[PDB]
Amino acid sequence: MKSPEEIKGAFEVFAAKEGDPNQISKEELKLVMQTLGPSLLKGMSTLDEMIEEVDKNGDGEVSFEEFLVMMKKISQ
Ligand SMILES: [Ca+2]
Ligand SMILES: [Ca+2]
């Protein structure tokens, strides 16, 4: 899996499109989904499945810590 620094770079770009600069909203996660596409796993590859898997605290947005866990899961 990518290093925490590489993942942080990608996270920051996606998270600073709209709203909270430090969280990825569902609408921002749509762009993450479009970029990761066929690398997303079965059961976490629709936008709904993805955020449900990734958003551990249920605030409806994806934090850096949550995003790191997502990237780990995708790459085994
Ligand atoms: Ca954001
Ligand atoms: Ca969250």
UniProtKB/Swiss-Prot annotation:
Under the heading SUPFAM superfamilies, the entry gives: EF-hand
Positions of modified residues (Phosphoserine): 39
Q: Is the keyword Lyase in the record? A: no
User: Sorted alphabetically, which Gene3D superfamilies does this protein's record hold?
Assistant: EF-hand
Protein name per Swiss-Prot or TrEMBL? Protein S100-G
* Keywords, comma-separated and alphabetical: Acetylation, Calcium, Metal-binding, Phosphoprotein, Repeat, Vitamin D
Q: Which GO terms describe its cellular component?
A: apical plasma membrane; basolateral plasma membrane; cytoplasm
**Residue span, EF-hand domain:** 10-45, 42-76
Q: Which InterPro entries match?
A: EF-hand-dom_pair (IPR011992), EF_Hand_1_Ca_BS (IPR018247), EF_hand_dom (IPR002048), S100/CaBP7/8-like_CS (IPR001751), S100_Ca-bd_sub (IPR013787)
Pfam families per record: EF-hand_1, S_100
Q: Which species is this UniProt entry from? A: Bos taurus (Bovine)
Tell me, what is one Gene Ontology molecular-function annotation carried by this entry? Answer: calcium ion binding
UniProt-annotated binding residues for Ca(2+) 1? 23, 28
Q: Where does Ca(2+) 2 bind?
A: 55, 57, 59, 61, 66
PANTHER family under this entry?
PROTEIN S100-G, S100 CALCIUM-BINDING PROTEIN
